[PDB]
Amino acid sequence: GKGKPRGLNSARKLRVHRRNNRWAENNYKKRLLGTAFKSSPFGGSSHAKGIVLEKLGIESKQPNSAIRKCVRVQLIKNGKKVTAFVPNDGCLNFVDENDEVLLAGFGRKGKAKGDIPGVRFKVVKVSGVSLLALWKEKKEKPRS
Amino acid sequence: PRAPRTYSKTYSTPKRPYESSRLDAELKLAGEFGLKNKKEIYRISFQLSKIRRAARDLLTRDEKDPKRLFEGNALIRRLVRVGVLSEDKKKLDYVLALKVEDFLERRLQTQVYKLGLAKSVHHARVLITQRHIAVGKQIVNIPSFMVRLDSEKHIDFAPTSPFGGARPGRVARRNAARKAEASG
Amino acid sequence: LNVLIKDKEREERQARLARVRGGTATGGAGKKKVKGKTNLGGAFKKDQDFDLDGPDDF
Amino acid sequence: AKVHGSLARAGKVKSQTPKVEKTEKPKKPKGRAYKRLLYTRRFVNVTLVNGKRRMNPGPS
Amino acid sequence: GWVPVTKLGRLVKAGKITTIEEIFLHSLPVKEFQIIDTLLPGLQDEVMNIKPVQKQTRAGQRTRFKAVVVVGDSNGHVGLGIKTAKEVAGAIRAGIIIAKLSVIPIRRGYWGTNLGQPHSLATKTTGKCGSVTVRLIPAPRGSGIVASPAVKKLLQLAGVEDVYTQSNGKTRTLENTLKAAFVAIGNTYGFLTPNLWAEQPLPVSPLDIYSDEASA
RNA sequence: ACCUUACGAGAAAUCAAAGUCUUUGGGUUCUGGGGGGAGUAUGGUCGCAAGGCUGAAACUUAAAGGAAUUGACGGAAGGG
RNA sequence: CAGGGCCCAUUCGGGUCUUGUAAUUGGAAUGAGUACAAUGUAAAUACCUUAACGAGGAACAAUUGGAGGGCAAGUCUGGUG
Ligand SMILES: [Mg+2]
Ligand SMILES: [Mg+2]
Ligand SMILES: [Mg+2]
Ligand SMILES: [Mg+2]
Ligand SMILES: [Mg+2]
Ligand SMILES: [Mg+2]
Ligand SMILES: [Mg+2]
Ligand SMILES: [Mg+2]
Ligand SMILES: [Mg+2]
């Protein structure tokens, strides 16, 4: 009889079975436990400002031979330490030190993106100026 | 606070962005009817989808049903009035078989071209937009006007314009000023 | 500047081998022939088997 | 692991690219006119053909 | 020329058989493609994809090309052929032969009210190849073929104007999904409906009217 | 329990049930939702103990897996 | 400047009847903008209307993302290695 009950008064069993088995999912369990509000560095927001600690030369995974040019940043709202990847060619020459950067995710919904081992965020703005505007020389930085 | 203004969106982009057949179809439509973007074609396919959804909701209803009779006659009447639906085909099954070229033939741009005041759909577009056109005795500068098939007899040039007369225009008056300057 | 250098040498190399009738400098005495280029199209890049076989040849 | 590296090389190729200046072109039309020229290049004037229509042929 | 070898080929060359409905009516097995392109001269073909298959060997991989072809004329008939060959052009040519050999009819119908010509299918109909199941549901006018691109072109080539489709299984396996859709539109003439309930006089075969236009 | 078909089913191996399942509803109970981390931590609860039963997450990863095919190999068996 | 049968039944001659390119030239048309005025408004601003001015290629110059696949669009040319 296909598993599940079929009787006309058996809605309670179907409801509680659906709740119990809804816990087996990924997105539902994450939303209902609220791990984004508790165990996420951004705390569930899309973006976050932080202060650059140092500049890292993280090497990519196999097979890929490169140095990926990320930075360590301490978040302003949490004080949490975070690694952020500075996206384009030559753009690490803007992100020097003690700066206010704005950070976003990479799009992989909390996962490390590519051959880059263990970074989950990218840099968007440095010192209030966006990184592509600096890269395309539309604008230029303040002194500090 | 005051009552909120209602608004609605009038188009919808298609589901697959890059499909070569649909792209070549919409470019044929835009070239033949003189349109500027794909948003106009999306607007017409949205309007047609709403008409088809109402007709689909009525044909599930049985015949002699009062809602089906009332709203089917009203929808058929609005379609035969604007001229998208022919005078013989008036049975709510022809409504389903309509397609976007039926709506696109009724715009003021293609009507100005078909009446022959224009020589092109692109000339028709700029003639409408630059206010040399009047569907009643009233200027219309909207190319998507959807003339109502007793207004087709009355599309003509505006009275307060050149090409309907009584004063030439800026560049003509300038050139006449230069030639009267050279005469004196 | 280096691109300037390369382009200029290219143009000059057109000029020297204008007078000399065949291929390389010194011609048939030379013992060295003039090479050509293989028009591959796009066939062999990141080399594989060709799905697009040609039905007819001009 | 290897969190260090050679940070001195950043921007190498972007600095090595020779600056080639853009040629100045006539303006392309905007709007309905641009769709008009795309329609004309695709449907009435199909001057370039190889039995299959291509939009950006490399020099054959 | 052709110089046919089948009784059916001699009959279709002589002009005794002037339609393929007689073949579909008497379930005559076609084995010569010249019958099909003689009786349906207007069908036009399209090759779906060419994917390479490989057999491992002592040194490397013997590779061959699999071509999927759909023929059809745009009212009532479709054929599906799939052929593996050493050469891509041979695979396409032989697939056009195989697709012409497998031509079956389609029962078009009405979603309601029988006013115009038949636009849609008569019933819901399913088909299955591999894990893939394709279901086909009759749609109102102006709905168009609501299908993924391959099975949309197959239903366009059948002559259907509007049909809802539902899939199940590994639908990215294109050859299996085409064979499932082929079985699904083949079943349209398999379903018995109350308009088909009335009895028929069982007409006699052209192979016995014209029995002396065979070889001897 | 076995043998043969394949009406049928299935991804196949195979199956008289693993059929009567997109033409999807005879009744009912239990379990699963990509691979790890992990049957791990932690809290209960049973046990003299050894342990049993319940049982996560952070983080990490683009496959892990099933059944078949063709090769290659075997301190496997035969033949020429 | 790159094209069809035919009037021709006048072999590679005008090409009507069109379709698009042009370091080839012409006038027409109009708002964006500016501004008397009136209207608008509690008073204004703006819209609607309207004298006067306001166009045409360095002018009144549309971007944003892309061009291996998914998924429209390179049988390119330099650079790095
Ligand atoms: Mg009950
Ligand atoms: Mg996980
Ligand atoms: Mg990888
Ligand atoms: Mg599905
Ligand atoms: Mg295995
Ligand atoms: Mg761009
Ligand atoms: Mg790029
Ligand atoms: Mg590029
Ligand atoms: Mg493509």
Side-chain angles (χ1 to χ4, degrees), chain E residues 91-120:
Chain E
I92 299 158
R93 270 169 299 141
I96 298 158
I97 303 302
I98 288 151
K100 264 171 208 145
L101 283 176
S102 67
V103 168
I104 48 158
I106 313 292
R107 199 192 173 186
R108 276 151 323 161
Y110 296 98
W111 184 79
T113 193
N114 80 358
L115 188 153
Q117 297 305 117
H119 59 285
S120 188

mmCIF file of all heavy atoms in Angstrom, chain E residues 91-120:
data_model
loop_
_atom_site.group_PDB
_atom_site.id
_atom_site.type_symbol
_atom_site.label_atom_id
_atom_site.label_comp_id
_atom_site.label_asym_id
_atom_site.label_seq_id
_atom_site.Cartn_x
_atom_site.Cartn_y
_atom_site.Cartn_z
ATOM 1 N N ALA E 91 27.698 8.127 -40.986
ATOM 2 C CA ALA E 91 26.739 8.007 -39.896
ATOM 3 C C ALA E 91 25.484 8.817 -40.162
ATOM 4 O O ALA E 91 24.373 8.329 -39.944
ATOM 5 C CB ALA E 91 27.383 8.433 -38.583
ATOM 6 N N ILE E 92 25.633 10.035 -40.690
ATOM 7 C CA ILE E 92 24.454 10.844 -40.997
ATOM 8 C C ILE E 92 23.661 10.270 -42.173
ATOM 9 O O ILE E 92 22.431 10.188 -42.104
ATOM 10 C CB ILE E 92 24.858 12.314 -41.202
ATOM 11 C CG1 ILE E 92 25.481 12.841 -39.914
ATOM 12 C CG2 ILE E 92 23.671 13.165 -41.513
ATOM 13 C CD1 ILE E 92 26.354 14.031 -40.089
ATOM 14 N N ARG E 93 24.338 9.836 -43.247
ATOM 15 C CA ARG E 93 23.649 9.236 -44.399
ATOM 16 C C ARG E 93 22.889 7.968 -44.022
ATOM 17 O O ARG E 93 21.706 7.798 -44.366
ATOM 18 C CB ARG E 93 24.651 8.925 -45.511
ATOM 19 C CG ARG E 93 24.863 10.050 -46.509
ATOM 20 C CD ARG E 93 26.056 9.781 -47.426
ATOM 21 N NE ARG E 93 27.339 9.663 -46.733
ATOM 22 C CZ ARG E 93 28.284 8.780 -47.053
ATOM 23 N NH1 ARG E 93 28.087 7.918 -48.040
ATOM 24 N NH2 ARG E 93 29.426 8.753 -46.386
ATOM 25 N N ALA E 94 23.546 7.075 -43.281
ATOM 26 C CA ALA E 94 22.896 5.840 -42.889
ATOM 27 C C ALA E 94 21.814 6.084 -41.852
ATOM 28 O O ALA E 94 20.812 5.364 -41.837
ATOM 29 C CB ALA E 94 23.934 4.857 -42.375
ATOM 30 N N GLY E 95 21.958 7.121 -41.025
ATOM 31 C CA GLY E 95 20.889 7.464 -40.109
ATOM 32 C C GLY E 95 19.661 8.013 -40.806
ATOM 33 O O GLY E 95 18.543 7.780 -40.361
ATOM 34 N N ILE E 96 19.849 8.772 -41.889
ATOM 35 C CA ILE E 96 18.703 9.193 -42.697
ATOM 36 C C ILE E 96 17.994 7.993 -43.327
ATOM 37 O O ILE E 96 16.756 7.953 -43.383
ATOM 38 C CB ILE E 96 19.137 10.242 -43.738
ATOM 39 C CG1 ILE E 96 19.662 11.476 -43.022
ATOM 40 C CG2 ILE E 96 17.979 10.676 -44.604
ATOM 41 C CD1 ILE E 96 20.569 12.318 -43.838
ATOM 42 N N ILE E 97 18.759 6.976 -43.755
ATOM 43 C CA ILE E 97 18.133 5.746 -44.267
ATOM 44 C C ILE E 97 17.319 5.039 -43.181
ATOM 45 O O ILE E 97 16.167 4.638 -43.396
ATOM 46 C CB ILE E 97 19.194 4.800 -44.862
ATOM 47 C CG1 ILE E 97 19.993 5.484 -45.963
ATOM 48 C CG2 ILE E 97 18.546 3.560 -45.429
ATOM 49 C CD1 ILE E 97 19.152 5.996 -47.085
ATOM 50 N N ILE E 98 17.912 4.884 -41.997
ATOM 51 C CA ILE E 98 17.267 4.172 -40.896
ATOM 52 C C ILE E 98 16.052 4.939 -40.385
ATOM 53 O O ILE E 98 15.014 4.348 -40.070
ATOM 54 C CB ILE E 98 18.298 3.885 -39.790
ATOM 55 C CG1 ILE E 98 19.247 2.802 -40.254
ATOM 56 C CG2 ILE E 98 17.657 3.348 -38.556
ATOM 57 C CD1 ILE E 98 20.592 2.923 -39.650
ATOM 58 N N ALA E 99 16.152 6.265 -40.320
ATOM 59 C CA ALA E 99 15.036 7.093 -39.891
ATOM 60 C C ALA E 99 13.891 7.048 -40.887
ATOM 61 O O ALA E 99 12.725 7.065 -40.488
ATOM 62 C CB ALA E 99 15.506 8.524 -39.674
ATOM 63 N N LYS E 100 14.195 6.993 -42.185
ATOM 64 C CA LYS E 100 13.129 6.816 -43.164
ATOM 65 C C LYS E 100 12.480 5.449 -43.048
ATOM 66 O O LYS E 100 11.281 5.323 -43.293
ATOM 67 C CB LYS E 100 13.655 7.008 -44.578
ATOM 68 C CG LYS E 100 13.452 8.392 -45.118
ATOM 69 C CD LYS E 100 14.184 8.568 -46.421
ATOM 70 C CE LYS E 100 14.557 10.015 -46.627
ATOM 71 N NZ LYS E 100 15.864 10.151 -47.313
ATOM 72 N N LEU E 101 13.250 4.413 -42.715
ATOM 73 C CA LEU E 101 12.667 3.081 -42.587
ATOM 74 C C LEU E 101 11.663 2.971 -41.442
ATOM 75 O O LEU E 101 10.757 2.137 -41.498
ATOM 76 C CB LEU E 101 13.765 2.042 -42.422
ATOM 77 C CG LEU E 101 14.455 1.708 -43.736
ATOM 78 C CD1 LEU E 101 15.596 0.749 -43.503
ATOM 79 C CD2 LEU E 101 13.459 1.151 -44.713
ATOM 80 N N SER E 102 11.803 3.792 -40.403
ATOM 81 C CA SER E 102 11.018 3.660 -39.182
ATOM 82 C C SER E 102 9.857 4.649 -39.099
ATOM 83 O O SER E 102 9.498 5.072 -38.000
ATOM 84 C CB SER E 102 11.924 3.824 -37.969
ATOM 85 O OG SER E 102 12.411 5.143 -37.906
ATOM 86 N N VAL E 103 9.246 5.011 -40.219
ATOM 87 C CA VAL E 103 8.229 6.055 -40.213
ATOM 88 C C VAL E 103 6.898 5.476 -39.757
ATOM 89 O O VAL E 103 6.437 4.459 -40.283
ATOM 90 C CB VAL E 103 8.127 6.710 -41.597
ATOM 91 C CG1 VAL E 103 6.919 7.577 -41.704
ATOM 92 C CG2 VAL E 103 9.336 7.555 -41.827
ATOM 93 N N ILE E 104 6.281 6.130 -38.775
ATOM 94 C CA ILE E 104 5.045 5.697 -38.125
ATOM 95 C C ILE E 104 4.056 6.852 -38.179
ATOM 96 O O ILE E 104 4.465 8.014 -38.299
ATOM 97 C CB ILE E 104 5.301 5.259 -36.665
ATOM 98 C CG1 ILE E 104 6.149 6.307 -35.950
ATOM 99 C CG2 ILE E 104 5.948 3.898 -36.630
ATOM 100 C CD1 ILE E 104 6.037 6.278 -34.466
ATOM 101 N N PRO E 105 2.753 6.580 -38.086
ATOM 102 C CA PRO E 105 1.785 7.676 -38.060
ATOM 103 C C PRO E 105 1.455 8.161 -36.654
ATOM 104 O O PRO E 105 1.667 7.475 -35.657
ATOM 105 C CB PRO E 105 0.554 7.042 -38.717
ATOM 106 C CG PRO E 105 0.618 5.665 -38.247
ATOM 107 C CD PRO E 105 2.067 5.290 -38.277
ATOM 108 N N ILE E 106 0.917 9.380 -36.601
ATOM 109 C CA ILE E 106 0.585 10.065 -35.358
ATOM 110 C C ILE E 106 -0.905 10.368 -35.391
ATOM 111 O O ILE E 106 -1.412 10.870 -36.400
ATOM 112 C CB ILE E 106 1.384 11.370 -35.201
ATOM 113 C CG1 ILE E 106 2.858 11.140 -35.515
ATOM 114 C CG2 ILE E 106 1.249 11.918 -33.801
ATOM 115 C CD1 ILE E 106 3.578 10.296 -34.565
ATOM 116 N N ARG E 107 -1.608 10.075 -34.305
ATOM 117 C CA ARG E 107 -3.020 10.431 -34.201
ATOM 118 C C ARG E 107 -3.181 11.805 -33.565
ATOM 119 O O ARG E 107 -3.120 11.946 -32.343
ATOM 120 C CB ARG E 107 -3.784 9.382 -33.417
ATOM 121 C CG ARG E 107 -5.252 9.454 -33.662
ATOM 122 C CD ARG E 107 -5.981 8.608 -32.675
ATOM 123 N NE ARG E 107 -7.412 8.790 -32.801
ATOM 124 C CZ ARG E 107 -8.308 8.266 -31.981
ATOM 125 N NH1 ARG E 107 -7.919 7.530 -30.957
ATOM 126 N NH2 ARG E 107 -9.593 8.483 -32.192
ATOM 127 N N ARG E 108 -3.383 12.826 -34.387
ATOM 128 C CA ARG E 108 -3.733 14.138 -33.874
ATOM 129 C C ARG E 108 -5.219 14.247 -33.551
ATOM 130 O O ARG E 108 -6.057 13.569 -34.145
ATOM 131 C CB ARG E 108 -3.329 15.220 -34.863
ATOM 132 C CG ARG E 108 -1.887 15.624 -34.715
ATOM 133 C CD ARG E 108 -1.339 16.099 -36.024
ATOM 134 N NE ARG E 108 -1.867 15.323 -37.133
ATOM 135 C CZ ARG E 108 -1.845 15.727 -38.392
ATOM 136 N NH1 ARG E 108 -1.324 16.901 -38.699
ATOM 137 N NH2 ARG E 108 -2.343 14.953 -39.341
ATOM 138 N N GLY E 109 -5.539 15.126 -32.604
ATOM 139 C CA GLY E 109 -6.885 15.296 -32.089
ATOM 140 C C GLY E 109 -7.239 16.708 -31.671
ATOM 141 O O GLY E 109 -6.604 17.671 -32.091
ATOM 142 N N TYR E 110 -8.250 16.834 -30.818
ATOM 143 C CA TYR E 110 -8.743 18.109 -30.320
ATOM 144 C C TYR E 110 -8.686 18.131 -28.803
ATOM 145 O O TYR E 110 -8.953 17.121 -28.151
ATOM 146 C CB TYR E 110 -10.184 18.353 -30.733
ATOM 147 C CG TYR E 110 -10.413 18.482 -32.202
ATOM 148 C CD1 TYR E 110 -10.862 17.402 -32.940
ATOM 149 C CD2 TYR E 110 -10.194 19.683 -32.853
ATOM 150 C CE1 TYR E 110 -11.086 17.510 -34.275
ATOM 151 C CE2 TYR E 110 -10.415 19.799 -34.191
ATOM 152 C CZ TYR E 110 -10.864 18.706 -34.898
ATOM 153 O OH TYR E 110 -11.091 18.809 -36.241
ATOM 154 N N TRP E 111 -8.318 19.277 -28.240
ATOM 155 C CA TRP E 111 -8.500 19.475 -26.809
ATOM 156 C C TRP E 111 -9.972 19.634 -26.458
ATOM 157 O O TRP E 111 -10.399 19.253 -25.366
ATOM 158 C CB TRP E 111 -7.704 20.698 -26.371
ATOM 159 C CG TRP E 111 -7.717 20.972 -24.931
ATOM 160 C CD1 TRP E 111 -6.983 20.355 -23.982
ATOM 161 C CD2 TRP E 111 -8.486 21.966 -24.261
ATOM 162 N NE1 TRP E 111 -7.249 20.889 -22.752
ATOM 163 C CE2 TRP E 111 -8.175 21.884 -22.901
ATOM 164 C CE3 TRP E 111 -9.412 22.919 -24.681
ATOM 165 C CZ2 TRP E 111 -8.759 22.711 -21.958
ATOM 166 C CZ3 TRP E 111 -9.990 23.731 -23.747
ATOM 167 C CH2 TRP E 111 -9.662 23.628 -22.403
ATOM 168 N N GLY E 112 -10.760 20.156 -27.379
ATOM 169 C CA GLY E 112 -12.192 20.249 -27.202
ATOM 170 C C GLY E 112 -12.828 20.682 -28.500
ATOM 171 O O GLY E 112 -12.149 21.164 -29.411
ATOM 172 N N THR E 113 -14.123 20.396 -28.615
ATOM 173 C CA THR E 113 -15.167 21.070 -29.400
ATOM 174 C C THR E 113 -15.043 20.889 -30.914
ATOM 175 O O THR E 113 -15.862 21.463 -31.639
ATOM 176 C CB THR E 113 -15.356 22.571 -29.078
ATOM 177 O OG1 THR E 113 -16.582 22.994 -29.679
ATOM 178 C CG2 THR E 113 -14.290 23.505 -29.654
ATOM 179 N N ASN E 114 -14.022 20.170 -31.406
ATOM 180 C CA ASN E 114 -13.790 19.686 -32.775
ATOM 181 C C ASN E 114 -14.035 20.686 -33.907
ATOM 182 O O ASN E 114 -14.482 20.317 -34.992
ATOM 183 C CB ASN E 114 -14.511 18.327 -32.998
ATOM 184 C CG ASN E 114 -16.034 18.394 -33.283
ATOM 185 O OD1 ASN E 114 -16.678 19.431 -33.298
ATOM 186 N ND2 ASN E 114 -16.598 17.223 -33.534
ATOM 187 N N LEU E 115 -13.659 21.943 -33.700
ATOM 188 C CA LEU E 115 -14.070 22.989 -34.626
ATOM 189 C C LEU E 115 -13.194 23.036 -35.877
ATOM 190 O O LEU E 115 -13.692 22.903 -37.000
ATOM 191 C CB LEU E 115 -14.071 24.328 -33.885
ATOM 192 C CG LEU E 115 -14.600 25.636 -34.461
ATOM 193 C CD1 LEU E 115 -15.039 26.492 -33.303
ATOM 194 C CD2 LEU E 115 -13.531 26.378 -35.227
ATOM 195 N N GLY E 116 -11.896 23.242 -35.721
ATOM 196 C CA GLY E 116 -11.079 23.398 -36.907
ATOM 197 C C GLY E 116 -10.593 22.075 -37.444
ATOM 198 O O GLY E 116 -11.384 21.144 -37.596
ATOM 199 N N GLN E 117 -9.291 21.988 -37.767
ATOM 200 C CA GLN E 117 -8.460 20.817 -37.985
ATOM 201 C C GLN E 117 -7.868 20.334 -36.663
ATOM 202 O O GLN E 117 -7.752 21.115 -35.715
ATOM 203 C CB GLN E 117 -7.353 21.145 -38.976
ATOM 204 C CG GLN E 117 -7.879 21.513 -40.342
ATOM 205 C CD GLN E 117 -8.792 20.452 -40.916
ATOM 206 O OE1 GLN E 117 -9.974 20.696 -41.147
ATOM 207 N NE2 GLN E 117 -8.250 19.266 -41.150
ATOM 208 N N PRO E 118 -7.519 19.051 -36.547
ATOM 209 C CA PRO E 118 -6.858 18.557 -35.327
ATOM 210 C C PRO E 118 -5.515 19.218 -35.046
ATOM 211 O O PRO E 118 -4.556 19.063 -35.801
ATOM 212 C CB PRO E 118 -6.695 17.064 -35.610
ATOM 213 C CG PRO E 118 -7.740 16.752 -36.543
ATOM 214 C CD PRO E 118 -7.909 17.934 -37.417
ATOM 215 N N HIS E 119 -5.447 19.926 -33.921
ATOM 216 C CA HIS E 119 -4.251 20.638 -33.491
ATOM 217 C C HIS E 119 -3.401 19.887 -32.488
ATOM 218 O O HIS E 119 -2.188 20.099 -32.446
ATOM 219 C CB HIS E 119 -4.623 21.995 -32.897
ATOM 220 C CG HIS E 119 -5.534 21.926 -31.713
ATOM 221 N ND1 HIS E 119 -6.874 21.644 -31.825
ATOM 222 C CD2 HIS E 119 -5.305 22.140 -30.401
ATOM 223 C CE1 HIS E 119 -7.431 21.680 -30.631
ATOM 224 N NE2 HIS E 119 -6.499 21.973 -29.748
ATOM 225 N N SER E 120 -3.995 19.029 -31.670
ATOM 226 C CA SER E 120 -3.295 18.468 -30.526
ATOM 227 C C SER E 120 -3.402 16.960 -30.590
ATOM 228 O O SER E 120 -3.864 16.430 -31.593
ATOM 229 C CB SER E 120 -3.885 19.000 -29.222
ATOM 230 O OG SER E 120 -3.103 18.596 -28.120
#
